[PDB]
Amino acid sequence: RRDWENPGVTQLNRLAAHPPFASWRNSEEARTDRPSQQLRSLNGEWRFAWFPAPEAVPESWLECDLPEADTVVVPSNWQMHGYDAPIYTNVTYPITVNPPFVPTENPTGCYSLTFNVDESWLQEGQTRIIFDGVNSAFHLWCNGRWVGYGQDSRLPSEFDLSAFLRAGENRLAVMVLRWSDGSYLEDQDMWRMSGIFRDVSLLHKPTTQISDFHVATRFNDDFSRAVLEAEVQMCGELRDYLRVTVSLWQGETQVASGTAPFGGEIIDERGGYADRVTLRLNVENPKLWSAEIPNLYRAVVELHTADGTLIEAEACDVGFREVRIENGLLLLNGKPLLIRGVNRHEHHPLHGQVMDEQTMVQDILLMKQNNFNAVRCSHYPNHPLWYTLCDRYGLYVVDEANIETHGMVPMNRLTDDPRWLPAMSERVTRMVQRDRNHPSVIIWSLGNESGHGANHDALYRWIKSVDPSRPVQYEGGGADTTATDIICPMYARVDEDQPFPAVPKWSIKKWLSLPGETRPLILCEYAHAAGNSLGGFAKYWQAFRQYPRLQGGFVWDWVDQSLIKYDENGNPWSAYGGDFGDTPNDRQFCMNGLVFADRTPHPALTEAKHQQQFFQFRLSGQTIEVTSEYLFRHSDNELLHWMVALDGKPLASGEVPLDVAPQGKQLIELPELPQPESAGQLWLTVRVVQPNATAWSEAGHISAWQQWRLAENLSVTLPAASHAIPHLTTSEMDFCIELGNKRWQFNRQSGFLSQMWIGDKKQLLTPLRDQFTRAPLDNDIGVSEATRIDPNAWVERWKAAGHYQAEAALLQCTADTLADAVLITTAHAWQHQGKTLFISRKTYRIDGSGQMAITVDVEVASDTPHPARIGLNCQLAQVAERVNWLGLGPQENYPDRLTAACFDRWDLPLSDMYTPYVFPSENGLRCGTRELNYGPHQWRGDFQFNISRYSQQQLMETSHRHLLHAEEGTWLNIDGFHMGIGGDDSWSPSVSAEFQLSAGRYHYQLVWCQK
Amino acid sequence: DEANIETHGMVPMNRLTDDPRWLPAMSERVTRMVQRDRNHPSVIIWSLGNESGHGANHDALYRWIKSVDPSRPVQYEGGGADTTATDIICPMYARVDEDQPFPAVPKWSIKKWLSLPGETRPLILCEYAHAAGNSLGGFAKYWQAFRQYPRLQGGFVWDWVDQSLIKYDENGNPWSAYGGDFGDTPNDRQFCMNGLVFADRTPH
Amino acid sequence: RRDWENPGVTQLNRLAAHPPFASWRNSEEARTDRPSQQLRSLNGEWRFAWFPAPEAVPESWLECDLPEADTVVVPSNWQMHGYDAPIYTNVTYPITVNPPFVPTENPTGCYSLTFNVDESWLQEGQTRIIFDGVNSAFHLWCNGRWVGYGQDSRLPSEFDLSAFLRAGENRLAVMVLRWSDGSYLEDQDMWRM
């Protein structure tokens, strides 16, 4: 029958979808959500054998264990155990596009388990098996007898095993197919794996059972009154003595309870549902649920007889909240939301796509700690525990159907075909039937990148009909089709339009006011965080805050999809597309997270945290104005700390408790501060500290901060005259300067400071030269597909122009002796194919104090692509343990991504001055730096810099971080100017004009001296 | 043009149509109809079927047609004749002046139906003036109303021809049979004959 | 697999639906809507045999005409030929309401046709068969090989027979089931045939 090559057959003998069940036979256990003796886990060690195709599977496998099989842990993806390679491809399908057919060589995983089943489970009731996640299709056998079939790798497939089991030992046989017609709806840009990767368990339900229940909460205008409505469905024989009681609990207090026999109201000419009943409970002054304060109640649904005999009980957490779009705004409990979200795949570097509670909790804590209040389930229903945690910790969730057909041409070829409507409908309907009771889910998504087809409109309407409590959204076909209540573009820019034909990405500010448009706009994806990214992030938030209908978005994305591999020594290293022999592959494009695979933050995380702060500030005179962006809570766990420092040196500080109501403001008058003595710039730095611990953070947690330049006193004091006068030694080949035991050597041939001595120890391994290039960032490379060679990308334009090939040609090199110093004047031209790209003119002034004043004036030909940077670089002969600097920090920060950094005195070990991006590139830069200290060296001025054991050349030529080797000495890059890193997307030039070095003529000065 | 979907015998009527497990089977009866007949100028209105109550599957298929073929209005009578699955109020046997306030699915008099708060759609009875036997009394009342009220745009009489079958007696002469004459049981007897003309097309 | 008791399976190997085709190889004929040589009718005399259930159908029938069968005209409702009785019920289903199951005693009509096909049709192109109406479900065989399945009594079911036909004589075998899960969607107030 080859059911795995037929979109008409998405399952066989599969039970109906429903909300989480546990079949408690005790109500208190249901109330407290404790383990149920009726819900057994079958996770653990299973038997496993791998086959090249389903036709290679021996019939004997159905009757008994294959000796050739191994014992492995379940859940798991078999690629993670080494049976075959995991494949990383973005758009292009991992298989030949020929729906509904899949390759004849179809990796087949045969799972089997021998287990016991208590006789008590078979003497009465129904025993079913539950597979929470099987990728991508499978056949089931119990004791050699065929049971059923199932598709959709992201939702549970349940089967009745009542007639298949026997008291004692039993054996299951599961044939998991890697590829199936379902694979055509699962073309998400992620690793392609397979197997039983989610839980497997047995559930025993009585014959007369609760087969489904829906919980709805409606409110009056001011939310002071609520009605909890619970519809309950049952299966089995209807009896007049049967009853359903629904009780609502607030902690250990019972708030309300209602009982009633079965039999619903009249529906149509034929009657009503005799097997259903709806309980309505009144609730006064309900504690409302929100991401801010996740208030929760517990609803227990008991099925019982009139004489008080419990048959079974189910239950769920209930969050009282209303979600609705009104007059163009997405409102929660009547307040307009501002979505600080992020897309999040279920990925683990060792276990692949298998999710565990610990990793989930770790992600949520890190998310809330970094000011995120929402998550999009890109691009499929998640492990059932995710929703429970988001309900309890408080995060708004966009639950998304497992449907992506990106590799089709056009994208909507399948979604506009009615023959695929059935398969698509199940991926949407079974998601809703499963997650509809979770308060954390506030929006339904029809899928991702499947263009826009008629099948979308049908399913959109289906949701709106069965569940009017949640808005529905979908980005395909232009982000504003008739299948979405929300304009949800991906990578649409703030001010710049991208007028693509048919599916244009208008700037978000413009999109809102297009003739006739009235819907709110929330980007489903934005600020692509691939590698050194998030440049321009602050631009989005300034817009989100200014425009009511711009209600945020979800950053792409949370965690790098890198996998752990081990070298000969057994040392682990991070791998990406193509490191498993997988091909075609899209290499490093699977890594776009704010955090590394092991959850260590990327520098970009701090920028997001800062921009997504819930408190805003304005300074006026001595008054700090604090505005709360919380919609429901007062600042009852916040105190503001302020600090004033003169160039890093603390002068005054203090703290005032914060007491601002949601959306309110507070004025904090700073005490009179004694004006500083010495010259310099005074800086005010405020930060919000939460004194008390919470479910998501520790005491002392910093949730927000901001800085302001205060008074500055320019230095007018003339330095005391020097004691000695530097001496100039002119030779045919050099210009050497002597002063004490210090020496400076300038090569008259190259025209660069080739060497500098302190005593007799050389300070440089490589001369000090200009540098106008950088090891390309993921954004500079600009490709989402390894097969695309984009000429328009920055790196390609830089190479073509010869920036990476340019060579300095000495135009001038003279030396003069001044009354108290030596002046070396030079001029260089950088050319490529007879074209002068850059002209750099410098002057070096070394005086009696041993300080070398370097002035650099650069010319950049207007018709050459704007350079990555304008500065100098050299390889210092020495290596120190610390790096001290007065500037923006402490973390890596670039021109278009430095709002989170603070000007102050920072001191870190050399290693922290290097960011371990899996795919090496320019990194570790720090801007607004006025002083840099390293070893015995000190550089002063107004520059940007990075310092590490890796030259731009090595980073540029090494594809993986684990292959980098520390070079002798220390590489120093000091830039007068540096181009933005961009990030609006990573497959087209994204550096905003204001951050491009297009001025033509640049000037910067650096003083180099001994410390 | 009407999809082959009628689940009248269910309790309640929408038991299958509000069940997503039956959405596939239902979608094929609607989608394959549209793909076959969309080029015929005679077809001016699509129908989602008959007497299947009103379920979510109806709303889904209703929108599917509106999306693939905007040139024709879509109508459906199940669930009250005025649900979100129909562009036309299309009751069956709703009377001209007399209301029939059935619970949940009332059949208002057609003149009153048009003006209910918020109602704006045209009204065309998908079925009316049941011509079973000596019938059609009051027919003229409908037409006086159709002519006076702009939004009352007619209807479809039920129905065209008796569903009687030919049987033969001892002499071998033909006679007109109805429910139960073939030993079929249970059966609803003469209720299959509601036409304006006899089975042989002779006028009533 | 009892495909007639599974609303999840409404057809097997059925071609996409589409507007009326005639495949003219002459435009003038297409303009005047004249008969097309590429569209052959298979209406006429067929071989038919009635069975109380699909389980009673002998395997021999798949590759050889049953001698007990009669020659009947098609299209036709078998109740009209007297094989069993037509049923008239208004609202109440003629079968026990227990979706998606139907009675085990499911009147089965076995149709077969021996017909010719010219090599010119098989040497090039696609040859498909079209059933404009089959009540209410059926399995199709061609020269003893299973071809497909179909439901919905009021729309055409088309199947590609290009790989099952041969030059010369060919034999179709169609097993039509009176009841199927599709019957649950066909409870119109009319005779049940």
Ligand SMILES: O=C1O[C@H](CO)[C@H](O)[C@H](O)[C@H]1O
């Ligand atoms: O548009 C997109 O951009 C991302 C690029 O990393 C990723 O492929 C998402 O799944 C896709 O929706």
Ligand SMILES: O=C1O[C@H](CO)[C@H](O)[C@H](O)[C@H]1O
């Ligand atoms: O409401 C109806 O009335 C008629 C009674 O003869 C017939 O049963 C139609 O099919 C049905 O829609």
Ligand SMILES: [Mg+2]
């Ligand atoms: Mg399939």
Ligand SMILES: [Mg+2]
């Ligand atoms: Mg994609």
Ligand SMILES: [Mg+2]
């Ligand atoms: Mg700032």
Ligand SMILES: [Mg+2]
């Ligand atoms: Mg079927």
Ligand SMILES: [Mg+2]
């Ligand atoms: Mg009826």
Ligand code: NA
């Ligand atoms: Na806004």
Ligand code: NA
């Ligand atoms: Na990606």
Ligand code: NA
């Ligand atoms: Na406080």
Ligand code: NA
């Ligand atoms: Na690199």
Ligand code: NA
């Ligand atoms: Na009128």
Ligand code: NA
């Ligand atoms: Na009738």
